[PDB]
Design a protein around this ligand. Structure first.
Ligand SMILES: [Zn+2]
Ligand SMILES: [Zn+2]
Lengths: 96, 147, 34, 139, 117, 41
């Protein structure tokens, strides 16, 4: 509906991608924090990660809470077809 | 479309892509294209009525064939060019059914997502649970499992 | 008519028919035939 | 901003307009019709204006054919047999998939016009480019 | 302002170039292939619109209304024929996607009404 | 930003809104007929 106020120094477009990426990044961060918060200290995943032997703090949040956005060449998956990633979707949709 | 489905003169294979945003329509008969079968849907309901599966399940008696299904015109071959300009209904049991509308204009329905996998990787159980590079390594190891 | 619960067996029997008809090396055979 | 073409068995970049004239359309209106279909496209006529403002000096199909023979792998010594070299180029190599004959000249012209129209649309930005990885464009 | 097309020398079916007339200070589109002259209707002979502010409604065709892939909605009816159902989509035209502009076409056939909200 | 504008390259390409040419043999009278014609004459 065109109420977006384009950020100075960049196009309305890039502003829109930046806002969407910010939203999703915040969601993933909060999700991972909440997930890793509660593990009872008995989980062997937690044992290994805490010991640092194999893995990393981000490793659990994929398996337990959510995968998180995926990227190709450092951006959103492109419109390989006509403006739509996969035919299962409708033309000109920007849903995550 | 109808005459292709009936394969009277337009063979089932040949594809036609109608570009709407631009005034043009193309017909592709030349060899070398890649295509896969898909369910047709005319209204919100699919064209694979319960009757057809009845005859199909009683195989080796009716001599009923997938080619006979093609003749019945419920399923059709789709190439990438045509796929470019046609909406797809993922699961007829869940998508085409009236609900909070997404587009309500679906034109084809998938036989089953498991059909996207390949010959080697289809043997992996629960691929939807594994990180993809592991899936690729497993698919490239499965060519060596002695048996 | 079609039933969402029976859709599983329906689709799988369709696939079974399709493979039992064609095989796994169809395009290879058919290209050489042509 | 002009448009040129690269053709097989040709060592130079012949302009589009002289190629059309060698085909046989020496008039302006015929070429303009073959290039633009919506004749009220000033946007596109202003883009094509430079190229058509280049080969206008040549107006004879025979002269265009002699030029085609010039700068050729086996260019004719004079217009003699250079016109023949140009003619065989225009017949066998110029888009044979649409046909190779006397009567196919007009169809060749029309399809050349179509492809250059697509090029102009691409430059204008109305139509999107193509991605070679699109297996829709791979056989 | 507006663009200007080619004045055409009719009899030989060619085009005309503007040349000035010293005697009377008027512009005359004359043929180079032959001698044929037409008065210059307007003083604007060449123009260059650079802002690229073009009414994309004219470029938009109504025939896209029937396509199934495009989205459909009822929020905004067709003005002249009042039809509720409209299809809204994007430019798909380069150097114009910088701004997200929604273009509506009525779904009612035979009206082919197009507009931007 | 003043120093910015001082340094960053600027070209007429990116500053012109649009352009055109008009055959106006009489400087006093112009097709645009804007106020500036009187100032010029
Ligand atoms: Zn003339
Ligand atoms: Zn209407």
């Amino acid at each position: 509906n065109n109420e977006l106020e384009p950020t100075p120094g960049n196009t309305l477009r890039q502003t829109f991608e930046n806002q969407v990426n910010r939203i999703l990044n915040d969601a993933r961060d909060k999700t991972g924090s909440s997930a890793q918060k509660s593990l009872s200290e008995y989980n062997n995943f937690k044992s290994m990660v805490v010991s640092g032997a194999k893995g990393s703090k981000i490793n659990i949040s994929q398996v337990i809470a959510v995968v998180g956005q995926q990227n190709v060449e450092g951006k959103r998956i492109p419109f390989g077809f006509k403006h739509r990633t996969l035919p299962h979707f409708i033309k000109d949709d920007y849903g995550p | 479309r109808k005459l292709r489905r009936q394969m009277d003169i337009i063979v089932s294979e040949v594809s036609m892509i109608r570009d709407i945003r631009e005034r043009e329509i193309r017909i592709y008969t030349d060899a070398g294209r890649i295509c896969r079968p898909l369910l047709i849907v005319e209204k919100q309901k699919l064209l694979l009525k319960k009757r057809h599966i009845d005859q199909l399940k009683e195989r080796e008696y009716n001599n009923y064939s997938w080619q006979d299904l093609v003749a019945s015109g419920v399923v059709e071959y789709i190439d990438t060019l045509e796929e470019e300009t046609v909406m797809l209904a993922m699961t007829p049991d869940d998508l085409q059914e009236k609900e909070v509308a997404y587009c309500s204009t679906y034109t084809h329905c998938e036989i089953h997502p498991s059909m996207i996998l390949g010959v080697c990787a289809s043997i992996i159980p629960f691929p939807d649970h594994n990180q993809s590079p592991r899936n690729t390594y497993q698919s490239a190891m499965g060519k060596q499992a002695m048996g | 008519e079609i039933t969402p619960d029976l859709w599983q067996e329906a689709c799988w029997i369709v696939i079974s028919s399709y493979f039992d008809e064609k095989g796994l090396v169809r395009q290879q055979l058919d290209s050489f035939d042509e | 901003q002009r448009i040129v073409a690269t053709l097989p068995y040709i060592k130079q970049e012949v302009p589009i307009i002289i190629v059309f004239r060698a085909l046989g359309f020496v008039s302006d209106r015929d070429i303009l019709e073959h290039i633009i279909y919506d004749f009220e496209d000033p946007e596109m006529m202003e883009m094509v204006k430079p190229s058509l403002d280049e080969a206008f000096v040549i107006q004879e199909q025979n002269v265009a054919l002699n030029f085609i023979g010039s700068r050729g792998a086996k260019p004719g010594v004079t217009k003699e047999k250079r016109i023949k070299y140009a003619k065989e180029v225009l017949q066998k190599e110029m888009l044979p998939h649409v046909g190779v004959s006397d009567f196919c000249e007009t169809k060749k012209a029309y399809f050349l016009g179509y492809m250059v129209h697509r090029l102009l649309l691409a430059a204008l930005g109305r139509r999107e480019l193509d991605d070679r990885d699109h297996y829709g464009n791979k056989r | 302002p507006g663009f200007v097309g080619i004045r055409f020398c009719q009899e030989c079916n060619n085009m005309l170039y503007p040349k000035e007339d010293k005697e009377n200070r008027i512009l005359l589109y004359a043929c180079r292939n032959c001698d044929y002259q037409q008065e210059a209707d307007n003083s604007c002979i060449y123009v260059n619109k650079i802002t690229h502010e073009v009414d994309e409604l004219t470029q938009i065709i109504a025939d896209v209304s029937q396509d199934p892939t495009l989205p459909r909605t009822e929020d905004h009816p067709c003005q002249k024929c009042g039809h509720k159902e409209a299809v809204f989509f994007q430019s798909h035209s380069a150097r114009a996607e910088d701004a997200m502009r929604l273009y509506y076409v009525c779904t009612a056939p035979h009206c082919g009404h197009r507009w931007t909200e | 930003k003043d120093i910015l504008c001082r340094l960053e390259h600027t070209t007429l390409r990116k500053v012109t809104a649009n352009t055109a040419i008009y055959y106006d043999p009489n400087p006093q009278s112009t097709v645009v007929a804007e106020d500036q014609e009187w100032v010029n004459v």
